[PDB]
Design a binder for these strands. Structure first.
Ligand SMILES: [Mg+2]
Ligand SMILES: [Mg+2]
Length: 99
RNA sequence: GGAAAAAUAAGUAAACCCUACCAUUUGGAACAACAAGAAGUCGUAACAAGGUAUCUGUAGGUGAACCUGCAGAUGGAUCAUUA
């Protein structure tokens, strides 16, 4: 089971990798960013449609210049995209991915 | 005789204190909401006889809605049965 293979997308400049910490509501969450900062993310209008996100998922996060404290949830990683990220050496090898 | 200074008595009374207030703003320890939205939590009170009909007053209980007592209203789920 999976949605069609598409290229694992990396953190471009202005984005950061993140892991979901707790659930807020109104389509919001607290994320731990691999920037090293906690932020409060809002979920994309795109993602609100397609991909349901939950706790401890690994997500890509589009950042904001002005408010660093808020960030936008960009895309969710499939656990395979994640293990691949670890392979590539983008995100640290000690991280908990749950199924 | 006139008359400056200086003094005198009573008054007008500014300003500064003490008391007690009113008005228009304002600083403030300590408390601390409300409306809107939705992919957080616990349950499911209400809409159907919401699965114990709701609802009003009151009173008591109580994670949460709510629950129970008494009197009341159909906005009721009855306009209606002496033989
Ligand atoms: Mg809710
Ligand atoms: Mg009470």
């Amino acid at each position: 089971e999976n949605e069609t293979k598409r290229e694992l997308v990396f953190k471009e400049e202005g984005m950061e990798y993140a892991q979901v910490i707790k659930m807020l509501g109104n389509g919001r969450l607290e994320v731990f960013c691999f920037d090293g900062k906690r932020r409060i993310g809002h979920i994309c209008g795109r993602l609100k449609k397609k991909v349901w996100i939950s706790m401890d998922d690994i997500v890509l996060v589009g950042l904001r210049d002005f408010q660093d404290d808020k960030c936008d949830i960009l895309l969710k990683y499939l656990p395979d995209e994640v293990r691949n990220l670890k392979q590539y050496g983008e995100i640290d090898e000690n991280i908990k991915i749950n199924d």
